[PDB]
Each structure stands twice: as C-alpha cells, then as structure tokens.
Design a protein around this ligand. Sequence first.
Ligand SMILES: [Ca+2]
Ligand SMILES: [Ca+2]
Ligand SMILES: [Ca+2]
Ligand SMILES: [Ca+2]
Lengths: 48, 149
Amino acid sequence: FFQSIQALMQTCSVLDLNAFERQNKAEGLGMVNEDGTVINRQNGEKVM
Amino acid sequence: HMADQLTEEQIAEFKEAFSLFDKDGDGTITTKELGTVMRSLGQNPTEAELQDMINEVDADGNGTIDFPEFLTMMARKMKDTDSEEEIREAFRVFDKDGNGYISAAELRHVMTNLGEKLTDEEVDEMIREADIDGDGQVNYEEFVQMMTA
Ligand SMILES: [Ca+2]
Ligand SMILES: [Ca+2]
Ligand SMILES: [Ca+2]
Ligand SMILES: [Ca+2]
C-alpha cells in the first residue's frame, strides 16, 4: 500500500518549462484537419 | 497528406484509372500491363524505358506498381502544380470585383469579413502605403513587392 503511494507521488508532474516552451510554439502554428477545418484543436495539455 | 491533396471523388477516379491499367485485377501493374495501355494511346515504347517509368514511382522496388504507389504519384502531381502562385489567390480575396486593382471599398469588404474592424479612416493609411503610384488603388504588382493592404 505505501510502496504504491510512494511510487505514485514520485510520478506526479511539476511545472516543466521545456514542455511549456513546446506548447507555445505549437499553438502558434495554427494547425487544421483534413475533413473540414478545426479551429486550434485543444488536445491534452502537456504541462502538469 | 492524401486527404488534403485528394478528395473522395478524386480517389474514386484514380481507382478507376488504376483498374483500367490493372486488367488482371491482382492489384499490381506490370510492364506488359503498362505497355498495353501505352499502345492504345499510340505510343510504342521499349521495355528499357518501360521499366524506367515504373522504377521512377515504384517505392518498395518489387518491380510492380500497386494502388498505394499509384495514389502517391497522383498526390505529388496535384501538389506540385502550385509552387508560388499562392499570392494570386490572396490578391483575389482582396480583389472582389475581378480587375487588377485593390480598391479601398474592396479592402473594406475583406476587413469587414475579418475580425478586426476599421473606423473608415485608417483604411486610407495602409492603402496609400501599399499603393506607391498614388492612384488610390493597389495593383497586383504593388501587392507582391510589399503587402500591407
Ligand atoms: Ca496485374
Ligand atoms: Ca510496388
Ligand atoms: Ca478591384
Ligand atoms: Ca496603384
């Protein structure tokens, strides 16, 4: 029980600037899909 | 990607064209199959160039052309038609009427459709910057050299 709890706490994420920098460039591209056009798709956040 | 370059109708048309080459229906294009349709169109090539025009698009090197390779050929042909003419469509978006000049009212029309709004006075600010001649209209030549309006 406590080994599982300790392992889970070690896998908890914190603020990552490298991930944050990547997202800022990603949102600046303005991607779209093929079938139609998606307006800045909101796929899963990668910072915390 | 193929979905960007090709539509559902174009994929259907290409499949019919591929099936026209593949009389057997096995799913691959051989040299004799490719040679047969060329003779129907009048050309009488030799097997030396016939193999070369297959290897030029054959990706896996198996010596035969399947539908995935056939679509990849057509996808490139549709894509490479436009190289730098993208500014022509951009010019026509501002040029509603269809002539060779961009008017202030036409610039108002596109700006009205876009999110930002103008107070009917700063529209003259950027049009005079783009229009070097001073005639009040931005032509195609003035647009490509410097784009502000
Ligand atoms: Ca065949
Ligand atoms: Ca092949
Ligand atoms: Ca015009
Ligand atoms: Ca002019």
